[PDB]
């Protein structure tokens with residue numbers, strides 16, 4: 076449980092690392108709908124999520140288990156797939172970062 080949350084923290088550090096920055100950068104901070112002119116974003120996305128919020132929740136010991144952590148990371152990707160045209164670069168970037176996430180999450184010590 077501690078060990079599983081350390082694995083989750085390792086994944087989070089990797090998703091925020093320079094290695095993945097080319098496709099991870101749209102997920103670093105909350106979507107600023109107003110700044111991007113996406114005035115329908117908060118009508119379509121009821122539960123915004125981003126890696127800075129995941130990092131705050133990890134630092135605050137909000138996550139009680141790996142499943143709660145994974146739920147937030149996957150919510151972040153789901154929001155991207157729900158809102159954006161499926162042929163837009165941001166969806167390709169989501170797919171690439173979710174591939175990194177899912178393959179390493181699958182190696183959870185258990």
Ligand SMILES: CNC(=O)c1cc(C(=O)N[C@H]2CC[C@H](O)CC2)n([C@@H](C)c2ccccc2)n1
Nearest residue numbers: 101102106111154155158159160163164165168
């Ligand atoms: C998690 N972030 C997102 O969901 C998101 C959505 C967007 C965005 O601007 N989406 C538009 C693109 C034009 C289209 O006609 C409507 C939707 N962006 C910006 C930062 C973006 C990311 C990647 C490359 C260009 C622009 N991040």
